[PDB]
């Protein structure tokens, strides 16, 4: 008989993030030659995918889970920068040149801005 | 009232743009920056 009175802060945060990601998906969509770079950020890791919405696939993906990018002793911003470089030349290997950056409903700053400029300086112009 | 007023350029002073405004909300002479065709750039347009 332990029923919390209201919504947990985790539920509020998840709902707000989903809602304001959907509100930005109104204008942002990915195509075959212009795919959408959607980034998901947690308190411990970051993940990025290259999504072609007209068919619903993922041409390339990168994250902090893999041990290669786990090995860098750098800070979370450094991990994001490495993830950005990894997604950048993985997309290079995928034949994709121009992308659109989907920030996934988070504020454009900190780690997200970090891997955004990391991908930008690696040759992926967007 | 919102009377029709004219905004002239600063350099060549041609009364190009016109619009209405409240003479009591902004009794002072309006200042706005607009595109001037013959000069080809963006300069402020002043009231007359």
């Amino acid at each position: 008989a332990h029923k919390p009175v209201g919504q947990n802060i985790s539920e509020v945060r998840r709902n707000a993030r989903l809602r304001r990601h959907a509100r930005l998906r109104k204008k942002v969509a990915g195509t075959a030659e212009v795919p959408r770079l959607v980034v998901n950020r947690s308190a411990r890791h970051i993940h990025v995918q290259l999504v072609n919405d007209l068919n619903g696939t993922t041409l390339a993906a990168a994250s902090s889970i893999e041990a290669d990018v786990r090995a860098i002793d750098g800070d979370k911003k450094a991990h994001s920068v490495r993830v950005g470089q990894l997604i950048a030349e993985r997309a290079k290997a995928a034949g994709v040149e121009t992308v659109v950056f989907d920030r996934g409903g988070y504020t454009y700053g900190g780690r997200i801005a970090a891997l955004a400029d990391a991908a930008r300086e690696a040759g992926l112009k967007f | 009232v919102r009377p029709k007023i004219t905004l002239a350029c600063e350099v060549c002073k041609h009364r190009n743009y016109i619009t209405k405004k409240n003479r009591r909300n902004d009794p002072d002479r309006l200042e706005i920056k607009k595109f001037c065709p013959n000069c080809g750039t963006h300069q402020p347009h002043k009231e007359s």
Binding site: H2, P4, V5 | -
Partner: protein, 182 residues
Amino acid sequence: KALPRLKQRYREEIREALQQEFNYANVMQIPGVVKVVVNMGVGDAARDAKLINGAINDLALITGQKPEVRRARKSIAQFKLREGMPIGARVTLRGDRMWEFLDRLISIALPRIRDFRGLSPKQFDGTGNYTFGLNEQSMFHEIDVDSIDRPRGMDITVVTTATNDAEGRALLRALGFPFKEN
């Protein structure tokens, strides 16, 4: 390397006391306070603005941080209130600031209340949040008696993590709240 004594007390002995009283299945069902909100609704500020500035100074001196002016969100003719003019100030206290304000209030302000006979423990509402209101502002020594020119009470509310009135009242009593007995 520095903690408010109220926070130390809650973290060390009050948490254990609540745990043994209610036998929570997991260590994060322990009810702890979240924030303390101070309201002073002027109401008469619809006539004169300087009352709002006075309330701003009162809240700034009492809480220690600049309050927020609450606008009138509905226009009512009987109170000759329209949209846009200020009505009341409000301060949200969290963390160390809330702990220190609670300690100061409990140990200083309440005994300074004239003929202070206690606070009724019936003011909780379902989720164990205590809302009580004062009448003046002289109980705090942060604000000087000669400085004031008109009494101004407030509405203190302490929203806690607790789910029931019993747990909230137990937590407040362990915190040192001077409740009556009924």
